[PDB]
Amino acid sequence: MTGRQARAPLQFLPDEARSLPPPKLTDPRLAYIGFLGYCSGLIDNAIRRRPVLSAGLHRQFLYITSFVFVGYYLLKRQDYMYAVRDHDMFSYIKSHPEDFPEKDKKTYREVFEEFHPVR
């Protein structure tokens, strides 16, 4: 789905991204990114012949911090994009209400179907 008002260049975090609730502490996706950072540092120590689970503790801390930071900004952009998709959808509903009629919601007392007996 194309921009949609690139006037207003690429703008990694836009102005209206502060007009929506940001994600919070212990949300599961950033926790997944944090475990991904722990596994990143652990496997970094596993590349070279330095021992695993030791002697890379600042690398553990730096990789986990960096991934949580990056993933937090990515989550903010993600929720912005879904919100603007929602607003564009409902605004096109408002622009052409006539093209989308309410379907004939019959109750099942008057609905005829087929039966197709299995035996």
Partner 1 sequence: FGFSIVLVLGSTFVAYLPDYRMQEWARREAERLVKYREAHGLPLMESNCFDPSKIQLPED
Partner 2 sequence: MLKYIIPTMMLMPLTWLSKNSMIWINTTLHSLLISLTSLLLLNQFGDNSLNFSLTFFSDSLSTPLLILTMWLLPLMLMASQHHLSKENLARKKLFISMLILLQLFLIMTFTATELIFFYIMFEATLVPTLIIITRWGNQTERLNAGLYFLFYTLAGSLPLLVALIYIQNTMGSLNFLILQYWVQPMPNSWSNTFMWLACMMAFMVKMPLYGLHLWLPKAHVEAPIAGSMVLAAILLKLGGYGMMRITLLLNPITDFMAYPFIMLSLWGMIMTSSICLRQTDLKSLIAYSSVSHMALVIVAILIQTPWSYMGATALMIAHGLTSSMLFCLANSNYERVHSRTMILARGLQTLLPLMAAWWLLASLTNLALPPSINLIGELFVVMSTFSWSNITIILMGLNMVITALYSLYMLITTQRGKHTHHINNILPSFTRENALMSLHMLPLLLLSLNPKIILGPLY
Partner 3 sequence: SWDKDVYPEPPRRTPAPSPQTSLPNPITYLTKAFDLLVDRPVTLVREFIERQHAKNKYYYYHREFRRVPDITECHEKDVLCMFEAEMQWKRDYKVDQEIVNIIQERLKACQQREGESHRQNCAKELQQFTQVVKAYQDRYHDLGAHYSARKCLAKQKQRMLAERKATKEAA
Footprint (CB under 8 A) of partner 2, residues 18-57: 53
Q: From the list 2, 15, 49, 108, which residue makes contact with partner 3 (rule: CB under 8 A)? A: 108
- State the binding string over 52-91 for partner 1 (x if CB under 8 A, else -): ----------------------------------------
> Looking at beta carbons only, is 103 or 106 nearer to partner 1?
106
Rounded to a whole number of angstroms, the minimum distance from the CB of residue 52 to partner 2 is 9
DSSP class of 7: S
Residues touching partner 1: how many (CB under 8 A)?
3
Q: Which long-range contacts (CB under 8 A, 24 or more apart) does 69-75 make?
A: 70/33, 71/29, 71/30, 71/33, 72/23, 72/30, 73/12, 73/13, 75/23, 75/27, 75/29, 75/30
Owner of token pair 């695993």: 52
Distance CA 11, CA 77 (A): 10
105 binds partner 2 (CB under 8 A): no
105 binds partner 1 (CB under 8 A): no
